Design a protein around this ligand. Structure first.
Ligand code: CA
Ligand code: CA
Length: 69
């Protein structure tokens, strides 16, 4: 199930594992990834993906961002 795989990815991104992805958490995941992004790229991606501006991306939102852009 592709959708199931997406949720696995979501679970991977959420280190805190509270059903939310934070720039800090996302930053750490990208760091482990062996990829080194700047704070601005990380923030811009997060803000671009932050629609409620809440500063965090929930799964539903992650799905919308992951499904599209
Ligand atoms: Ca979180
Ligand atoms: Ca949000």
């Amino acid at each position: 199930d592709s959708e199931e795989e997406l949720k696995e990815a979501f679970r991977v991104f959420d280190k805190d594992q509270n059903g939310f992805i934070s720039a800090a958490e996302l930053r750490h995941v990208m760091t482990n990834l062996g990829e080194k992004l700047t704070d601005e790229e990380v923030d811009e991606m997060i803000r671009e993906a932050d629609v409620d501006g809440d500063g965090q991306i929930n799964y539903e939102e992650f799905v919308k961002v992951m499904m599209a852009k």
